[PDB]
Amino acid sequence: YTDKGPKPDGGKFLCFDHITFYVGNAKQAASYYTTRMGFTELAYQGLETGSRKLAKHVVRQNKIVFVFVSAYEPDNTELGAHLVRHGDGVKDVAFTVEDLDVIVKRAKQRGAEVVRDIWEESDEFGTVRFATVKTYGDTQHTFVERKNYKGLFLPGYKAPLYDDVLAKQLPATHLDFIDHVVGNQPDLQMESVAAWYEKVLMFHRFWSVDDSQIHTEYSALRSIVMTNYEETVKMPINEPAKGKKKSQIEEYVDYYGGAGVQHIALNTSDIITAIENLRARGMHFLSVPNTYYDQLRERLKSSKVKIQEDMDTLQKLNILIDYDEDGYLLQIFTKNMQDRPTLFLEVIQRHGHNGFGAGNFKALFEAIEADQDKRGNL
Amino acid sequence: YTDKGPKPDGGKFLCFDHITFYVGNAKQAASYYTTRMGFTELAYQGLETGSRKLAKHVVRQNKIVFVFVSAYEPDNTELGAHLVRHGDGVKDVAFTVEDLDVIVKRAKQRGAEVVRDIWEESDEFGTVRFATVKTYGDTQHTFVERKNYKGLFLPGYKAPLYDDVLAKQLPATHLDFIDHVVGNQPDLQMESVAAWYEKVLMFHRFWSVDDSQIHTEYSALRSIVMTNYEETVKMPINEPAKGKKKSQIEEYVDYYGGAGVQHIALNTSDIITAIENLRARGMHFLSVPNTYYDQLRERLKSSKVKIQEDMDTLQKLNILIDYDEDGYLLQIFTKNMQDRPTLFLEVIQRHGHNGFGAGNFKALFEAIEADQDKRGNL
Numbered sequence: 032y033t034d035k036g037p038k039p040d041g042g043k044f045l046c047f048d049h050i051t052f053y054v055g056n057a058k059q060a061a062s063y064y065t066t067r068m069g070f071t072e073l074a075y076q077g078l079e080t081g082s083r084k085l086a087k088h089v090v091r092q093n094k095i096v097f098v099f100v101s102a103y104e105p106d107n108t109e110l111g112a113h114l115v116r117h118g119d120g121v122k123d124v125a126f127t128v129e130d131l132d133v134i135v136k137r138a139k140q141r142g143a144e145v146v147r148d149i150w151e152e153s154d155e156f157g158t159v160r161f162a163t164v165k166t167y168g169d170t171q172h173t174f175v176e177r178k179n180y181k182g183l184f185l186p187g188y189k190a191p192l193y194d195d196v197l198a199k200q201l202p203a204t205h206l207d208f209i210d211h212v213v214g215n216q217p218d219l220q221m222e223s224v225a226a227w228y229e230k231v232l233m234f235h236r237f238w239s240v241d242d243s244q245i246h247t248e249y250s251a252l253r254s255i256v257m258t259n260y261e262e263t264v265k266m267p268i269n270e271p272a273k274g275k276k277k278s279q280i281e282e283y284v285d286y287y288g289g290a291g292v293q294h295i296a297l298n299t300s301d302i303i304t305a306i307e308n309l310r311a312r313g314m315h316f317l318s319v320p321n322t323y324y325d326q327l328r329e330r331l332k333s334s335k336v337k338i339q340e341d342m343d344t345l346q347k348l349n350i351l352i353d354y355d356e357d358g359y360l361l362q363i364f365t366k367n368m369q370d371r372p373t374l375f376l377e378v379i380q381r382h383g384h385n386g387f388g389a390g391n392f393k394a395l396f397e398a399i400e401a402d403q404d405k406r407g408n409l
Numbered sequence: 410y411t412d413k414g415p416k417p418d419g420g421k422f423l424c425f426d427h428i429t430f431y432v433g434n435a436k437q438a439a440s441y442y443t444t445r446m447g448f449t450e451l452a453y454q455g456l457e458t459g460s461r462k463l464a465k466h467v468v469r470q471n472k473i474v475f476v477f478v479s480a481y482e483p484d485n486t487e488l489g490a491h492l493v494r495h496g497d498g499v500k501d502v503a504f505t506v507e508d509l510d511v512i513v514k515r516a517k518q519r520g521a522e523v524v525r526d527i528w529e530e531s532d533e534f535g536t537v538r539f540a541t542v543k544t545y546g547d548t549q550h551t552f553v554e555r556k557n558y559k560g561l562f563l564p565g566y567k568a569p570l571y572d573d574v575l576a577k578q579l580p581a582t583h584l585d586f587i588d589h590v591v592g593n594q595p596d597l598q599m600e601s602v603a604a605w606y607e608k609v610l611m612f613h614r615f616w617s618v619d620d621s622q623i624h625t626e627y628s629a630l631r632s633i634v635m636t637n638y639e640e641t642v643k644m645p646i647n648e649p650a651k652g653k654k655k656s657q658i659e660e661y662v663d664y665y666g667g668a669g670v671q672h673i674a675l676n677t678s679d680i681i682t683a684i685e686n687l688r689a690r691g692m693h694f695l696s697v698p699n700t701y702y703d704q705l706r707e708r709l710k711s712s713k714v715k716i717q718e719d720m721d722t723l724q725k726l727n728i729l730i731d732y733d734e735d736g737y738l739l740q741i742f743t744k745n746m747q748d749r750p751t752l753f754l755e756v757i758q759r760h761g762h763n764g765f766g767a768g769n770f771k772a773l774f775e776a777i778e779a780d781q782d783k784r785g786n787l
């Protein structure tokens with residue numbers, strides 16, 4: 032029961048629909064996410080389906096859908112510029128919606144920059160209606176009115192030409208749905224971007240335990256989490272801030288060439304098995320010193336919260352914990368998805384805790400910085 | 410014993426040194442080739458090594474070395490333009506040489522466009538001297554004078570930050586060395602490109618059984634194979650030609666945006682195990698109708714050549730055969746390494762046959778076209 036602001040007169044954002052990436056080699060990118068991250072290739076458009084300008088590979092893990100897109104032709108102006116500016120990265124964060132027309136009319140009236148006005152596509156399995164507007168940077172939002180669409184992903188997509196015996200042979204990673212999608216902004220842009228979500232989409236600010244305590248000194252960022260009225264989609268917005276060390280938000284914006292998605296968090300209900308199986312697929316994660324766990328166990332000595340998972344196993348797998356007196360979450364961060372120090376992924380499991388892990392900024396900073404100081408900062 | 414032309418006064422091309430690819434996401438490209446194609450990540454340069462403009466991932470399988478390169482910074486003019494024009498593709502075909510200075514002086518005198526004049530790099534393990542010239546398209550040749558260099562690949566490269574438990578868990582693919590590297594040229598360019606190899610590098614034309622019989626009607630190409638004096642490096646040069654169907658060389662040049670490497674052939678001494686294990690890693694290859702093998706077995710009835718490998722297994726794995734009365738080769742072609750219909754790979758094993766498989770143009774055309782004609786060309 033919190034201040035959610037005025038209830039929108041019409042329109043609903045049900046959930047994240049899919050995330051679309053603009054990449055240099057969609058075939059190889061799909062292979063990376065299926066083999067390393069537990070996805071399965073679901074659907075495809077390309078030369079073989081009559082799509083002559085764009086190749087599209089759709090991969091799925093439970094409710095999580097990622098789409099990888101590349102150009103077929105030399106000197107594709109739009110995709111080419113994006114690739115050169117940003118490297119591989121997120122282009123579209125798509126939302127499943129009800130009452131598309133109200134949402135789009137309101138967004139347009141309130142100043143949204145339109146990429147494509149309402150359109151529909153159909154095949155043997157039904158019809159889907161869409162619209163696309165710009166958000167921060169070169170990122171966009173497609174609203175997807177799927178009317179319990181019974182086809183393969185979306186109209187026009189076809190089965191992949193081949194099955195993949197490599198991805199098939201690997202163990203399940205148990206990632207269920209997209210928990211949140213974080214967008215990094217350049218200096219001083221967080222408030223105007225958050226205001227866009229409030230005005231254009233009638234989102235509101237989501238207040239969690241992380242908003243109640245300052246972590247700027249360690250995190251070197253400020254964040255505002257924007258969410259739809261029913262709080263089913265969460266869009267954190269970061270900007271750099273003055274802290275004890277150079278801001279990773281500034282590094283992101285420098286190497287991404289502007290604002291963009293920093294991380295996508297994937298919610299799991301069995302993080303130990305998830306991380307064991309992601310590690311078996313060759314994924315790497317932040318290295319966590321043993322002192323983090325020694326200090327965490329000492330802090331937990333005065334807490335009434337009960338950690339259900341085996342702490343020795345969490346320590347072995349370098350899974351992080353954040354808690355208050357009413358619950359806790361588990362989280363872990365992958366290494367970067369590319370050479371540029373830009374996008375990474377997060378795996379998160381919640382036990383009655385609606386925050387984002389901000390306590391770990393201080394906890395990891397203290398454990399890692401102290402050890403490096405002892406090592407002469409060499 | 411054939412006409413090799415005049416023997417060069419100084420200089421030797423020993424072998425292929427490595428192939429460098431300019432790609433959108435070198436981290437993910439290295440992962441594709443290690444997991445799908447049997448390579449292992451060997452060495453690295455990037456932010457962690459002091460390389461602030463370029464990330465470089467080096468992967469190796471026996472003598473075969475592939476290097477994947479991406480830019481770190483937005484709007485890298487050279488790498489960006491290459492990426493937008495071509496997609497992911499080969500940038501540099503590097504040769505290991507002796508007497509670098511003669512080779513470079515001669516190439517420069519004879520009109521080579523220089524990318525970088527002779528330079529040297531050194532670390533704790535020794536020194537290597539290099540030079541780079543342009544060849545066809547945006548492709549270049551680096552000459553590598555490695556003086557039995559005892560370090561990790563080349564000076565300045567470091568160990569990868571992580572080992573990869575995915576690539577480690579997969580079965581060996583038995584690819585030994587680069588057999589040949591084929592370059593597709595636009596209409597009418599084959600002769601001038603072949604003449605460049607003869608004049609600038611003192612290569613000569615390699616004549617094989619494939620040059621003695623015409624296959625243009627089926628292959629829709631013309632080829633000249635250029636080779637160094639000792640015939641240790643083979644560089645086929647293709648151009649489109651008029652045949653029964655649209656030329657795959659024309660499709661390549663259209664989607665690559667000009668000349669470039671069409672395929673890299675990797676030599677194996679156990680093709681059955683190689684293909685079994687590449688298939689277990691999720692690689693796909695051209696589908697071959699059973700009629701190809703029925704017709705091949707009937708043609709072999711009048712030949713004195715003895716196929717050592719089990720033909721039923723070759724048929725199961727869709728491995729191709731080409732032969733004359735003095736020997737045979739086995740070969741197979743992967744599907745494309747990217748969405749654009751440009752680069753693919755070949756696995757080849759030779760049994761006393763120095764050709765390139767040109768007999769399979771007709772054999773596969775006849776088997777595939779006949780079946781499609783029966784299927785109404787739908």
Ligand SMILES: Cn1ncc(C(=O)c2ccc3c(c2)C(=O)N(Cc2ccccc2)C3=O)c1O
Pocket residue numbers: 211213241249250251254256267279364377387388389390391392393395396
């Ligand atoms: C809305 N919101 N707020 C936080 C989040 C996170 O995912 C999130 C939460 C905690 C951490 C990180 C990300 C992270 O990268 N590190 C490492 C680090 C980076 C700089 C300085 C000190 C430590 C953390 O400790 C989110 O989604």
Ligand SMILES: Cn1ncc(C(=O)c2ccc3c(c2)C(=O)N(Cc2ccccc2)C3=O)c1O
Pocket residue numbers: 589591619627628629632634645657742755765766767768769770771773774
């Ligand atoms: C120097 N040199 N000459 C040939 C080569 C090859 O690798 C090579 C040899 C045989 C074939 C292919 C490549 C190939 O793609 N197909 C399929 C096909 C393509 C168009 C029309 C009919 C059939 C073949 O049958 C090379 O390296």
Ligand SMILES: [Co+2]
Pocket residue numbers: 211213294296377387
């Ligand atoms: Co997060």
Ligand SMILES: [Co+2]
Pocket residue numbers: 589591672674755765
């Ligand atoms: Co070949």
